[PDB]
Amino acid sequence: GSHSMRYFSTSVSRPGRGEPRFIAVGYVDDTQFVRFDSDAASQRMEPRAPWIEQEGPEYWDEETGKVKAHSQTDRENLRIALRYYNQSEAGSHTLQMMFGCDVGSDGRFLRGYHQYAYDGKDYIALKEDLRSWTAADMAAQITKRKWEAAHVAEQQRAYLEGTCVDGLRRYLENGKETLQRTDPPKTHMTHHPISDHEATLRCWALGFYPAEITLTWQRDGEDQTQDTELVETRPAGDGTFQKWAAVVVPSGEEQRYTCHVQHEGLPKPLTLRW
Protein backbone atom coordinates (compact mmCIF):
# COMPACT_ATOMS: atom_id res chain seq x y z
CA GLY A 1 0.00 0.00 0.00
CA SER A 2 3.08 2.18 0.23
CA HIS A 3 4.31 4.23 -2.69
CA SER A 4 7.55 5.79 -3.81
CA MET A 5 8.90 8.85 -5.57
CA ARG A 6 12.38 8.72 -7.12
CA TYR A 7 14.49 11.11 -9.15
CA PHE A 8 17.46 9.73 -11.14
CA SER A 9 20.21 11.85 -12.72
CA THR A 10 23.23 10.98 -14.91
CA SER A 11 26.13 13.34 -15.71
CA VAL A 12 28.66 12.15 -18.30
CA SER A 13 31.78 14.21 -18.96
CA ARG A 14 32.87 14.63 -22.60
CA PRO A 15 36.49 15.85 -22.70
CA GLY A 16 36.85 17.86 -25.89
CA ARG A 17 33.15 17.57 -26.75
CA GLY A 18 31.87 20.33 -24.47
CA GLU A 19 30.19 20.43 -21.09
CA PRO A 20 29.00 17.24 -19.38
CA ARG A 21 25.64 15.84 -20.44
CA PHE A 22 22.91 15.76 -17.79
CA ILE A 23 19.75 13.67 -17.98
CA ALA A 24 17.21 13.49 -15.15
CA VAL A 25 13.95 11.53 -14.90
CA GLY A 26 11.22 11.25 -12.28
CA TYR A 27 9.09 8.28 -11.25
CA VAL A 28 6.11 7.65 -9.02
CA ASP A 29 6.18 3.89 -8.36
CA ASP A 30 7.02 2.34 -11.79
CA THR A 31 5.41 5.23 -13.74
CA GLN A 32 7.66 7.95 -15.21
CA PHE A 33 6.33 11.52 -15.18
CA VAL A 34 9.10 14.09 -15.97
CA ARG A 35 12.47 14.34 -17.69
CA PHE A 36 15.19 16.87 -18.40
CA ASP A 37 17.97 16.55 -20.99
CA SER A 38 20.74 19.15 -21.04
CA ASP A 39 21.27 18.60 -24.80
CA ALA A 40 17.58 19.08 -25.64
CA ALA A 41 16.65 22.37 -27.26
CA SER A 42 13.77 23.28 -24.92
CA GLN A 43 16.02 23.39 -21.82
CA ARG A 44 12.86 22.61 -19.83
CA MET A 45 11.61 19.97 -17.48
CA GLU A 46 9.05 18.24 -19.69
CA PRO A 47 5.95 16.18 -18.83
CA ARG A 48 5.91 12.42 -19.31
CA ALA A 49 2.60 11.38 -17.71
CA PRO A 50 -0.88 12.79 -18.40
CA TRP A 51 -1.68 13.59 -14.76
CA ILE A 52 1.32 15.92 -14.51
CA GLU A 53 0.26 18.03 -17.51
CA GLN A 54 -2.36 19.61 -15.22
CA GLU A 55 0.37 21.42 -13.25
CA GLY A 56 0.45 25.13 -14.01
CA PRO A 57 3.30 27.22 -15.33
CA GLU A 58 4.83 28.12 -11.96
CA TYR A 59 5.40 24.40 -11.45
CA TRP A 60 7.30 23.94 -14.72
CA ASP A 61 9.41 27.08 -14.19
CA GLU A 62 10.33 26.10 -10.62
CA GLU A 63 11.06 22.46 -11.51
CA THR A 64 13.09 23.60 -14.51
CA GLY A 65 15.13 25.87 -12.24
CA LYS A 66 15.82 23.12 -9.70
CA VAL A 67 16.99 20.53 -12.26
CA LYS A 68 19.19 23.08 -14.03
CA ALA A 69 20.87 23.95 -10.72
CA HIS A 70 21.47 20.21 -10.11
CA SER A 71 23.16 19.92 -13.49
CA GLN A 72 25.58 22.70 -12.50
CA THR A 73 26.23 21.20 -9.05
CA ASP A 74 27.18 17.83 -10.60
CA ARG A 75 29.20 19.54 -13.33
CA GLU A 76 31.27 20.79 -10.39
CA ASN A 77 31.21 17.49 -8.51
CA LEU A 78 32.53 15.68 -11.59
CA ARG A 79 35.52 18.05 -11.55
CA ILE A 80 36.18 17.60 -7.81
CA ALA A 81 35.95 13.80 -8.08
CA LEU A 82 38.56 13.89 -10.83
CA ARG A 83 40.78 15.71 -8.33
CA TYR A 84 40.10 13.29 -5.43
CA TYR A 85 40.82 10.26 -7.61
CA ASN A 86 43.85 11.91 -9.29
CA GLN A 87 42.47 11.22 -12.76
CA SER A 88 43.39 12.94 -16.00
CA GLU A 89 41.02 15.44 -17.56
CA ALA A 90 41.15 13.55 -20.85
CA GLY A 91 38.93 10.68 -19.68
CA SER A 92 35.15 10.59 -19.54
CA HIS A 93 33.35 9.84 -16.29
CA THR A 94 29.83 9.37 -14.91
CA LEU A 95 28.16 10.75 -11.78
CA GLN A 96 24.74 9.34 -10.92
CA MET A 97 22.43 10.64 -8.21
CA MET A 98 19.21 9.24 -6.76
CA PHE A 99 16.85 10.87 -4.25
CA GLY A 100 13.21 10.61 -3.18
CA CYS A 101 10.91 9.14 -0.54
CA ASP A 102 8.44 6.41 0.36
CA VAL A 103 5.07 7.01 2.04
CA GLY A 104 2.97 4.40 3.77
CA SER A 105 -0.51 3.33 2.75
CA ASP A 106 -1.06 5.63 5.74
CA GLY A 107 -0.04 8.55 3.54
CA ARG A 108 2.79 9.31 6.00
CA PHE A 109 6.56 9.40 5.56
CA LEU A 110 8.36 6.03 5.62
CA ARG A 111 11.81 6.53 4.09
CA GLY A 112 14.00 9.12 2.41
CA TYR A 113 16.91 8.60 0.03
CA HIS A 114 19.91 10.56 -1.27
CA GLN A 115 22.77 8.68 -2.96
CA TYR A 116 25.62 9.07 -5.45
CA ALA A 117 27.66 6.76 -7.61
CA TYR A 118 30.85 7.55 -9.52
CA ASP A 119 31.65 5.47 -12.62
CA GLY A 120 28.86 3.07 -11.69
CA LYS A 121 29.98 2.44 -8.09
CA ASP A 122 28.71 3.73 -4.71
CA TYR A 123 30.25 7.02 -3.63
CA ILE A 124 28.33 8.45 -0.65
CA ALA A 125 24.80 7.79 0.62
CA LEU A 126 22.53 9.23 3.32
CA LYS A 127 21.71 6.53 5.84
CA GLU A 128 18.14 5.77 6.82
CA ASP A 129 18.37 7.80 10.01
CA LEU A 130 18.98 10.92 7.84
CA ARG A 131 21.67 11.99 10.31
CA SER A 132 24.75 10.17 8.97
CA TRP A 133 26.43 9.16 5.71
CA THR A 134 27.99 5.99 4.35
CA ALA A 135 31.03 6.59 2.14
CA ALA A 136 32.43 3.88 -0.14
CA ASP A 137 36.17 4.78 -0.16
CA MET A 138 38.78 7.31 0.97
CA ALA A 139 37.73 9.78 -1.72
CA ALA A 140 34.10 9.78 -0.59
CA GLN A 141 35.27 10.11 3.02
CA ILE A 142 36.67 13.56 2.26
CA THR A 143 33.15 14.53 1.13
CA LYS A 144 31.70 12.73 4.16
CA ARG A 145 33.69 14.81 6.67
CA LYS A 146 32.88 17.97 4.70
CA TRP A 147 29.15 17.20 4.85
CA GLU A 148 29.12 16.33 8.58
CA ALA A 149 30.88 19.57 9.51
CA ALA A 150 28.24 21.50 7.53
CA HIS A 151 25.22 19.48 8.75
CA VAL A 152 24.07 18.73 5.19
CA ALA A 153 22.09 15.72 6.42
CA GLU A 154 19.93 17.82 8.77
CA GLN A 155 19.36 20.39 6.02
CA GLN A 156 17.98 17.73 3.66
CA ARG A 157 15.21 16.61 6.03
CA ALA A 158 12.86 19.46 5.18
CA TYR A 159 12.74 18.24 1.58
CA LEU A 160 12.73 14.50 2.27
CA GLU A 161 9.99 14.54 4.93
CA GLY A 162 8.08 17.57 3.64
CA THR A 163 8.29 18.60 -0.02
CA CYS A 164 8.99 15.04 -1.20
CA VAL A 165 6.09 13.57 0.78
CA ASP A 166 3.75 16.45 -0.10
CA GLY A 167 4.36 16.13 -3.84
CA LEU A 168 4.10 12.32 -3.91
CA ARG A 169 0.75 12.50 -2.10
CA ARG A 170 -0.59 15.14 -4.49
CA TYR A 171 0.57 13.10 -7.51
CA LEU A 172 -1.14 9.99 -6.13
CA GLU A 173 -4.40 11.94 -5.96
CA ASN A 174 -4.17 13.77 -9.31
CA GLY A 175 -3.45 10.39 -10.85
CA LYS A 176 -5.49 7.87 -8.84
CA GLU A 177 -6.78 6.25 -12.03
CA THR A 178 -3.24 5.43 -13.20
CA LEU A 179 -1.13 5.19 -10.05
CA GLN A 180 -3.55 3.58 -7.57
CA ARG A 181 -4.80 0.97 -10.05
CA THR A 182 -3.45 -2.57 -10.13
CA ASP A 183 -3.23 -4.52 -13.39
CA PRO A 184 -3.18 -8.29 -12.80
CA PRO A 185 -0.89 -10.42 -15.00
CA LYS A 186 -2.49 -12.18 -17.94
CA THR A 187 -0.77 -15.58 -17.96
CA HIS A 188 -0.25 -18.36 -20.49
CA MET A 189 2.27 -21.03 -21.18
CA THR A 190 4.13 -22.30 -24.23
CA HIS A 191 5.79 -25.61 -25.09
CA HIS A 192 8.56 -26.42 -27.56
CA PRO A 193 10.13 -29.84 -28.20
CA ILE A 194 13.88 -29.37 -28.58
CA SER A 195 14.74 -33.10 -28.98
CA ASP A 196 12.89 -36.34 -28.87
CA HIS A 197 14.21 -36.34 -25.29
CA GLU A 198 13.53 -32.80 -24.08
CA ALA A 199 11.14 -29.87 -24.37
CA THR A 200 11.01 -26.34 -22.99
CA LEU A 201 8.02 -25.02 -21.06
CA ARG A 202 7.74 -21.22 -20.82
CA CYS A 203 5.49 -19.49 -18.29
CA TRP A 204 4.32 -15.98 -19.29
CA ALA A 205 3.01 -13.02 -17.33
CA LEU A 206 1.80 -10.11 -19.47
CA GLY A 207 0.13 -6.73 -19.03
CA PHE A 208 0.69 -6.29 -15.29
CA TYR A 209 1.27 -3.27 -13.04
CA PRO A 210 3.16 -2.60 -10.83
CA ALA A 211 6.34 -4.29 -12.07
CA GLU A 212 6.92 -6.37 -8.92
CA ILE A 213 6.10 -10.05 -9.60
CA THR A 214 7.31 -13.56 -8.77
CA LEU A 215 7.41 -16.57 -11.12
CA THR A 216 8.63 -19.91 -9.78
CA TRP A 217 8.74 -23.45 -11.18
CA GLN A 218 7.90 -26.50 -9.05
CA ARG A 219 8.53 -30.13 -10.05
CA ASP A 220 6.29 -32.56 -8.18
CA GLY A 221 5.55 -29.80 -5.66
CA GLU A 222 9.18 -28.83 -4.89
CA ASP A 223 10.78 -25.58 -6.04
CA GLN A 224 13.15 -26.09 -8.96
CA THR A 225 15.88 -23.79 -10.22
CA GLN A 226 18.17 -26.24 -12.01
CA ASP A 227 17.65 -26.05 -15.80
CA THR A 228 15.43 -22.94 -15.43
CA GLU A 229 15.84 -19.43 -16.84
CA LEU A 230 14.18 -16.23 -15.70
CA VAL A 231 14.39 -12.99 -17.66
CA GLU A 232 14.49 -9.47 -16.27
CA THR A 233 11.06 -7.83 -15.98
CA ARG A 234 10.59 -5.58 -19.01
CA PRO A 235 8.34 -2.72 -20.22
CA ALA A 236 5.66 -3.46 -22.79
CA GLY A 237 5.75 0.25 -23.69
CA ASP A 238 2.09 0.90 -22.83
CA GLY A 239 2.80 1.26 -19.10
CA THR A 240 2.57 -2.45 -18.23
CA PHE A 241 5.30 -5.05 -17.77
CA GLN A 242 6.23 -8.54 -18.96
CA LYS A 243 8.17 -11.47 -17.56
CA TRP A 244 8.69 -15.14 -18.34
CA ALA A 245 10.29 -18.19 -16.77
CA ALA A 246 11.26 -21.33 -18.66
CA VAL A 247 12.35 -24.86 -17.76
CA VAL A 248 13.78 -27.70 -19.87
CA VAL A 249 12.00 -30.96 -19.07
CA PRO A 250 12.26 -34.62 -20.17
CA SER A 251 9.85 -35.28 -23.02
CA GLY A 252 6.69 -36.81 -21.65
CA GLU A 253 7.05 -35.37 -18.13
CA GLU A 254 5.52 -31.88 -18.71
CA GLN A 255 2.62 -32.52 -16.33
CA ARG A 256 4.65 -32.68 -13.11
CA TYR A 257 5.95 -29.11 -13.56
CA THR A 258 3.88 -26.19 -12.31
CA CYS A 259 4.51 -22.48 -12.63
CA HIS A 260 3.37 -20.23 -9.79
CA VAL A 261 2.56 -16.54 -10.24
CA GLN A 262 2.39 -14.00 -7.39
CA HIS A 263 1.40 -10.38 -7.94
CA GLU A 264 -0.32 -7.62 -5.97
CA GLY A 265 -3.34 -7.73 -8.26
CA LEU A 266 -3.76 -11.44 -7.71
CA PRO A 267 -6.12 -12.07 -4.78
CA LYS A 268 -4.93 -15.70 -5.12
CA PRO A 269 -1.62 -16.86 -6.63
CA LEU A 270 -2.05 -18.47 -10.04
CA THR A 271 -0.86 -21.98 -10.88
CA LEU A 272 -0.20 -23.00 -14.50
CA ARG A 273 0.31 -26.57 -15.69
CA TRP A 274 0.71 -27.96 -19.19
Binding site: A24, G26, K66, T73, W147, T163, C164, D166
Partner: peptide, 9 residues
Protein backbone atom coordinates in the same frame (compact mmCIF):
# COMPACT_ATOMS: atom_id res chain seq x y z
CA UNK B 1 8.91 18.15 -6.89
CA UNK B 2 12.66 18.24 -7.33
CA UNK B 3 15.07 19.24 -4.55
CA UNK B 4 17.20 22.39 -4.61
CA UNK B 5 20.66 20.77 -4.55
CA UNK B 6 23.91 22.79 -4.38
CA UNK B 7 26.38 20.79 -2.23
CA UNK B 8 29.93 20.17 -3.45
CA UNK B 9 32.02 17.06 -2.86
Amino acid sequence: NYDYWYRSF
